[PDB]
Write a protein that binds this DNA or RNA. Structure first.
Length: 49
DNA sequence: TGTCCCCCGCGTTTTAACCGCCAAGGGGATTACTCCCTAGTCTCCAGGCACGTGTCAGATATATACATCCTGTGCATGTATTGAACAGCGACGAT
């Protein structure tokens, strides 16, 4: 890309926190298995706590 | 047009050309004499030329490979141009 190199003066985490506005995110949820078949998918996940 | 040098002109130095006169024999010119050689003449015939003929060395036509002659691509390199990334200075608000 052209131009100079720039930084985020106030921490770059302001982007993903703003992008998460209005979404249905399941925090503290680790995925174990991922099942995929011809008629659908099934995701097995557990709680990190 | 521009340079460098190669002759031209001129004074002074060096050489032998030129003339005048004598001394000598080498060789060319001239004559007299003899015979060997060539022009002229005749007869004899084959060497040389015209004429005819047969054919292969060479000119002609047509197809291909070789040479070359010149212009147009490429390359490479240097240079010019432009964009970008270092560098102000000052006014403002936040601390």
């Amino acid at each position: 890309f052209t131009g100079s190199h720039l930084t985020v003066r106030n921490g770059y985490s302001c982007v993903p926190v703003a992008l998460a506005e209005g979404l249905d995110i399941k925090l503290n949820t680790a995925v174990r298995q991922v099942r995929y078949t011809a008629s659908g998918c099934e995701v097995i996940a557990v709680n990190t706590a």
